[PDB]
């Protein structure tokens, strides 16, 4: 909502989310506290709506735009888990950072083969 006030002023904004997986996991904790039934893998039943209510405000508008860079964490390295599976529905681009490229002394250490954009 601060990024949105910058948008209304007519600017282009960048919004960094340091770990969206923890936003999902805190929604799961709050859902459990409220006593709602557990969803596919124990996640909250409102997972795919709680994610969309956030990610749907990050859009270009005919007054401005908010672009977003989100650090993502994949549980157990599973790209099928409901949290990664729900997050990947919204991402437009995907940048992979690799330690091998850094050991080569190449910076930024972006892996160009797995890095992806639609």
């Amino acid at each position: 909502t601060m990024a949105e006030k910058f948008r209304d002023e007519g600017r282009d904004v960048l919004l960094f989310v340091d770990n969206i997986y923890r936003y999902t996991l805190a929604g799961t904790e709050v859902s459990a506290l409220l006593g709602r039934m557990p969803s596919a893998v124990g996640y909250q039943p409102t997972l795919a709506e709680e994610m969309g209510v956030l990610q749907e405000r990050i859009t270009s508008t005919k007054t401005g735009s908010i672009t977003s860079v989100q650090a993502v964490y994949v549980p157990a390295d599973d790209l099928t888990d409901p949290s990664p599976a729900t997050t990947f529905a919204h991402l437009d681009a995907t940048v992979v950072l690799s330690r091998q490229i850094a050991s080569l002394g190449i910076y930024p250490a972006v892996d160009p083969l797995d890095s992806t954009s639609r």
Binding site: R36, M37, S39, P45, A48, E49, L79
Partner: protein, 171 residues
């Protein structure tokens, strides 16, 4: 009519059902998730002219109406042995399965033969197209599996040098 994602209508219905405290089943989906899609897709149909007459009170005499549905389903990691994908495969007539490996290799549209089928079959086609394209999907069903099995070399080259150049140029 095109439903852009039934696999997300299913998720919204699961949310509604779990907020109403109903006991879930496999993959935490409700028990009646099948009856969610069936009573929907069972409405895409072709009706005889007597039904159109009885409906329109006679006004449209002797024409047959139809509604053609193409629902879209997204499957995780390419497996079709999953609850909702298999539930919808069990309702629609045909099945166009688009494969990620083919799609990355540049083959687009990535229509995977052998898995994709049309249960209406050649009855739907114009007879020219029906005759020209007789049995090729089942031909590729084996061309693929054999090119996968015979990886070391093109041995037993009876006609495989023609077979697996025809089946390459067709793709």
């Amino acid at each position: 009519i095109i439903y852009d994602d039934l696999s997300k209508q299913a998720v919204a219905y699961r949310q509604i059902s779990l907020l109403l405290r109903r006991p879930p089943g496999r993959e935490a989906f409700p028990g009646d998730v099948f009856y969610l899609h069936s009573r929907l897709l069972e409405r895409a149909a072709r009706v005889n002219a007597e039904y159109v007459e009885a409906f329109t009170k006679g006004e449209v005499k002797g024409k047959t109406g139809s509604l053609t549905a193409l629902p879209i389903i997204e499957t995780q990691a390419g497996d079709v042995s999953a609850f909702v994908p298999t539930n919808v495969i069990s309702i629609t007539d045909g099945q166009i399965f688009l494969e990620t490996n083919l799609f990355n290799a540049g083959i687009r549209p990535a229509v995977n033969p052998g898995i994709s089928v049309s249960r209406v079959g050649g009855a739907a086609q114009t007879k020219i197209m029906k005759k020209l394209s007789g049995g090729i999907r089942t031909a590729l069903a084996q061309y693929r599996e054999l090119a996968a099995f015979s990886q070391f070399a093109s041995d037993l080259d009876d006609a495989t040098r023609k077979q697996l150049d025809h089946g390459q140029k067709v793709t």
